[PDB]
Amino acid sequence: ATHRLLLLGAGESGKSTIVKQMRILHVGEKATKVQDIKNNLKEAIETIVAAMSNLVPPVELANPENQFRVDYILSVMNVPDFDFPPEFYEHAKALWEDEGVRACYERSNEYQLIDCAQYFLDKIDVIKQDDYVPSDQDLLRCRVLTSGIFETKFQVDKVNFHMFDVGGQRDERRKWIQCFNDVTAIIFVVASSSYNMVIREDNQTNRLQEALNLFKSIWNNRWLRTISVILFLNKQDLLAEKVLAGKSKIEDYFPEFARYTTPEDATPEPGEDPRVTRAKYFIRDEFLRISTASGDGRHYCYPHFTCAVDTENIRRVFNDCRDIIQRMHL
Amino acid sequence: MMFHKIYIQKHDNVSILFADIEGFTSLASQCTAQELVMTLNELFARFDKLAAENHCLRIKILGDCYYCVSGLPEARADHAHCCVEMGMDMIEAISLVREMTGVNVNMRVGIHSGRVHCGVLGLRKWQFDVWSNDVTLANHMEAGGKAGRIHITKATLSYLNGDYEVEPGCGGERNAYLKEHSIETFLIL
Amino acid sequence: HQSYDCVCVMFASIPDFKEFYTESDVNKEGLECLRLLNEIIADFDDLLSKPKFSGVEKIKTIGSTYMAATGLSAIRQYMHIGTMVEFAYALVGKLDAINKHSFNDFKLRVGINHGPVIAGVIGAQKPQYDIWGNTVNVASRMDSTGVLDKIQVTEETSLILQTLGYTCTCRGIINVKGKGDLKTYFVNT
Ligand SMILES: CNc1ccccc1C(=O)O[C@H]1[C@@H](O)[C@H](n2cnc3c(=O)[nH]c(N)nc32)O[C@@H]1COP(=O)(O)OP(=O)(O)OP(=O)(O)O
Ligand SMILES: Nc1nc2c(ncn2[C@@H]2O[C@H](COP(=O)(O)OP(=O)(O)OP(O)(O)=S)[C@@H](O)[C@H]2O)c(=O)[nH]1
Ligand SMILES: C=C[C@@]1(C)CC(=O)[C@]2(O)[C@@]3(C)[C@@H](O)CCC(C)(C)[C@@H]3[C@H](O)[C@H](OC(C)=O)[C@@]2(C)O1
Ligand SMILES: [Cl-]
Ligand SMILES: [Mg+2]
Ligand SMILES: [Mg+2]
Ligand SMILES: [Mg+2]
């Protein structure tokens, strides 16, 4: 019995990343994706340095000397085919070392910056090697935008799945419909940590709010009134840090959070700060109100607190899904 | 249940033909509004006959644009010659009536061979039609053809098994679409 | 087949569709696309069964272009002309309704006109109903050159609409092959 799962969600929600786990989990080409990793590393650093001066208030380096390295990273910013000369990794690391550069990093929400930022930047020493071979984690972390639809076909216990990845961006959403007809279920992805950020499309719409109106649009769709949604609340890790860090309070982006009190059926993971528990379930219920409004029991919504980069968490949740697909006879 | 049931179906290996009363308005400016409608109906009446003979299938009539296709309803591996023949008939046919019309007219045929998607759309006033990029190319072929000649694709030629004398259609220079997609075109002799 | 003296013909096309159409293995070779279009064409027909449009006749569908006509149910006298505009809006309301659920931005383009036509059938094989008349040729040309989300009306059509509570704007001159150059207008909203 073959299925067709369509992953939907806004941009950088983590769709592409989940399909990766499916290959990691149920399916030497790396030599090609090394490039993409160095490009991330480059965009990451040049984005941070670029925001340094534009932010309000501006961010000044702790090293006046590093001002020359700043000029470098910029002079090469727009550069077509970068050779990644051995110097790059030096000035780059030097800047990542700079306290002001990081100061600016802790405000990366005030500008568009990829997620693998800190991850990759913390390993310039490794990526620069000519013998550098990406680990499985460096692929789950690599970031490439998706344009169009691509179908991954894997198998589990002699059961077929046909994974569908589409562009989370807006101009991409128009291609979604081409997969709407005859689909087992929908895997809706949400950037649970991106509550204090805005989308790349217009730099104003809250990434989370966008993910909400998008979910509302799918749930209340005239062609998905019976198709069940498996809500994947992703980036829990990035979320928890933000919650504990406490630099940007949630009830300042979503005021309704102030009046929110942690659930009853709440099953917090082993050793989990109540503050986090409270936060993550907030975000989940926010989505549940959308799915509770309509639907009329013709289709249901099964949330999950997932972490696409963790092949361990994805292996787990993908099973709680495979169960639903069988248990519900979908 | 979710989407309306669609009455379509993919059909590979088929030849598509389009025709046009070249300079229709050039004659539409001398014949009574009715004489044109009779002439037009006269013409296609004969066409449809020719059509059923040559194993073709009239799909729809759009003013001076007539287009059928072979390979349907039941898949005939001979879908190549059928349209070529059809094109042949439509050529002489229009010439016979070109007399009764008492005016200068000629057909511009275009033929391409590929796969389609046929059926009906919406839910009211149904009319059998066809859809595919191949269907578009065939139309554009007709558009970029020559009076009295039958324009075809290299795809349509690979189905004629060297049974027809052809020459360079150079459609790339007559129609933009052919140019854009660099489509080798030829003309039956 | 008879001929009328005042029939209101309308053309509503979706220019943005030819591009939307894709033939990839993902979309079953352009099936899923035609599926969406089928929804659209169907959503449009669900208007013909409404009381206020009980006088509209869906003549056919050319590509992604809807062809209707009002005033064929006869032997103000020009009120069926305003209903064709009431219908044009109708299609829009529905074309953008679809955009909500498809994450698209399809825009409709209209070309309305009115005058003498020649209703009737054509084709020996499977006779199909269609109206002719120069009036139809201009209506189509009033669309191919129209502007998205704008209805294009001719002078007299412009006039009749004003005497019906409509405000208009002059698009400028436009070349209608066969009739030369003609001054057109955009209906205001
Ligand atoms: C004075 N004109 C007429 C008098 C009585 C009946 C029809 C006409 C008339 O102007 O017919 C035109 C369209 O209404 C009419 N037509 C087009 N599509 C349709 C269609 O879908 N339905 C109907 N009924 N008529 C259509 O056919 C004609 C062809 O015009 P095209 O713009 O299609 O140019 P062309 O096909 O390349 O010929 P051309 O002059 O280079 O050579
Ligand atoms: N830290 C962390 N990073 C994650 C997590 N899930 C995804 N990412 C990172 O987020 C970035 C964007 O992920 P991606 O899967 O490309 O989004 P997408 O939905 O596929 O977006 P698109 O490709 O349609 S525009 C990647 O760099 C990936 O490594 C998570 O749970 N934690
Ligand atoms: C509907 C989609 C699409 C892309 C598919 C297609 O093969 C067509 O329907 C044909 C070629 C095809 O159906 C044969 C008839 C006709 C009238 C020639 C159509 C139009 O040119 C369509 O374009 C327009 C302008 O609607 C076109 C090109 O549009
Ligand atoms: Cl998101
Ligand atoms: Mg993606
Ligand atoms: Mg012609
Ligand atoms: Mg024509």
mmCIF file of N, CA, C and O in Angstrom, chain A residues 6 19 38 80 113 156 161 180 189-190 192 222 274 328:
data_model
loop_
_atom_site.group_PDB
_atom_site.id
_atom_site.type_symbol
_atom_site.label_atom_id
_atom_site.label_comp_id
_atom_site.label_asym_id
_atom_site.label_seq_id
_atom_site.Cartn_x
_atom_site.Cartn_y
_atom_site.Cartn_z
ATOM 1 N N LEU A 6 2.423 15.145 1.478
ATOM 2 C CA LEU A 6 2.807 16.437 0.967
ATOM 3 C C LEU A 6 3.242 17.271 2.144
ATOM 4 O O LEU A 6 2.481 17.458 3.093
ATOM 5 N N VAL A 19 12.825 15.754 4.501
ATOM 6 C CA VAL A 19 12.948 14.801 3.422
ATOM 7 C C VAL A 19 14.363 14.216 3.481
ATOM 8 O O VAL A 19 14.584 13.067 3.094
ATOM 9 N N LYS A 38 29.944 25.822 1.859
ATOM 10 C CA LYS A 38 30.830 26.980 1.886
ATOM 11 C C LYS A 38 30.083 28.255 1.514
ATOM 12 O O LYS A 38 30.465 29.351 1.921
ATOM 13 N N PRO A 80 30.709 36.625 -7.993
ATOM 14 C CA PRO A 80 30.152 35.492 -8.747
ATOM 15 C C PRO A 80 30.659 34.124 -8.290
ATOM 16 O O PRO A 80 30.004 33.447 -7.496
ATOM 17 N N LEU A 113 18.646 36.172 8.172
ATOM 18 C CA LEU A 113 19.850 35.376 8.369
ATOM 19 C C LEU A 113 19.528 33.886 8.464
ATOM 20 O O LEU A 113 18.680 33.477 9.261
ATOM 21 N N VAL A 156 9.310 1.502 3.628
ATOM 22 C CA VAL A 156 9.434 1.118 5.033
ATOM 23 C C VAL A 156 8.623 -0.149 5.334
ATOM 24 O O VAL A 156 7.400 -0.159 5.179
ATOM 25 N N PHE A 161 6.143 4.987 0.392
ATOM 26 C CA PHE A 161 5.804 6.354 0.703
ATOM 27 C C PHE A 161 6.319 7.181 -0.456
ATOM 28 O O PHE A 161 7.304 6.819 -1.096
ATOM 29 N N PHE A 180 -2.449 18.553 -4.676
ATOM 30 C CA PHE A 180 -3.607 18.443 -3.809
ATOM 31 C C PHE A 180 -4.466 17.228 -4.098
ATOM 32 O O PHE A 180 -4.874 16.526 -3.179
ATOM 33 N N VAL A 189 4.612 21.941 8.260
ATOM 34 C CA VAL A 189 5.786 22.299 9.041
ATOM 35 C C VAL A 189 5.744 23.732 9.580
ATOM 36 O O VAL A 189 5.329 24.673 8.888
ATOM 37 N N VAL A 190 6.178 23.898 10.822
ATOM 38 C CA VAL A 190 6.166 25.212 11.439
ATOM 39 C C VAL A 190 7.469 25.504 12.172
ATOM 40 O O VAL A 190 7.983 24.659 12.915
ATOM 41 N N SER A 192 8.703 26.796 14.883
ATOM 42 C CA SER A 192 8.370 27.121 16.263
ATOM 43 C C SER A 192 9.281 28.128 16.975
ATOM 44 O O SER A 192 8.911 28.672 18.022
ATOM 45 N N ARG A 222 -10.939 24.299 0.302
ATOM 46 C CA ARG A 222 -12.088 23.652 -0.343
ATOM 47 C C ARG A 222 -11.733 22.318 -0.994
ATOM 48 O O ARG A 222 -12.604 21.620 -1.531
ATOM 49 N N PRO A 274 9.645 24.500 32.819
ATOM 50 C CA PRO A 274 8.224 24.819 32.697
ATOM 51 C C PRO A 274 8.002 25.986 31.747
ATOM 52 O O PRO A 274 6.985 26.044 31.047
ATOM 53 N N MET A 328 -5.755 5.187 11.230
ATOM 54 C CA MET A 328 -6.886 5.931 10.690
ATOM 55 C C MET A 328 -7.319 5.390 9.340
ATOM 56 O O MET A 328 -8.290 5.869 8.756
#
